[PDB]
Amino acid sequence: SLATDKDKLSYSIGADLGKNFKNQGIDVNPEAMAKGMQDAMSGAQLALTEQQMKDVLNKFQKDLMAKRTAEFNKKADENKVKGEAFLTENKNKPGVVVLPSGLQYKVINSGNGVKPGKSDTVTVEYTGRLIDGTVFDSTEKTGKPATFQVSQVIPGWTEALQLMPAGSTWEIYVPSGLAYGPRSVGGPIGPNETLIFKIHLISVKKSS
Template sequence: MTITPEEMKKLIVDLKKRAHDVQMRKIQELVVKNARESEKFPEENKKKDGIKTTASGLQYMVLKEGDGTSPGLTDFVTVNYRGTFTDGKEFDSSYAKGEPAKFQADGVIKGWIEVLPMMKVGSKWRIFVPPALAYGRGGLGNRIPPNKVLVFEIELLDVEKGNQVKDK
């Protein structure tokens, strides 16, 4: 039996479509699975000592209270941080990069935007960011799956007022 070039193209297109459909089903299942886990996590987490919950659903624990300045949203902050999933697997860290991160306080995910103005220089907090205040249903490429609660330890090292920043 001989297959014509047109039949071969159709077979390849059909195979790619089936593979794509399978991949999309897997992603959708992951979205639903992670959403369920993300809904359960805060209920269990809030039972732990020292956990506070904001109106948005963000949870935090003060590990060390600083006594310096609190940043405004247009200020630049210097922080050390470690980002993990709830299982402890690390996905990002300024420590691993070998230097603190510096950025404008409103230039990050919503969970950080909410918590940074609550912190003072010298503070170290652990925050638990629900998907709606992080990367949500879309995740972030291969690094952060959809609908994941993210856990960050943030140490606020410095604040520079937005109109006084040297090294933007």
């Protein structure tokens, strides 16, 4: 029973830690953990030498990073394989064009304005989704267009924008190499993920 907040806090700390252990593969014994925490807090002689524990925890970290490196490689290869399957089927579909870099696109509506240069600025309404349809960014959520310097977005966009007349709307299919490649820092887009964009290029502006 948890009468006091010392208990409520301790329990809450334990549950948060157990939750992080549970979904990380770390198989730990809560009773042996309580004993070592108690020995540390009481100032008693710990059951392991400073050195034994150091080896214990360093092996722990070594094994942990390896487990997390294998999972990342495993997902990186699954996405890569998924993306290739997708593009292989997509190249066959009507109106799809494949470029040397592997970028694919399909003209929805062809505009009549100018093609932007690698130093230009552009205004676009866009929507981006994973292969499974999961949308991860859209200007339609902002309710207004966005502006980018063509040379300052992912390679897939840079190669696409340079081919679109202003006023056009294209769907582009971006192999991970032209996108975020082996990403391991941002949640929305996993690693080696192929991306699908609807891009409406509104306006092009040069610079000085």
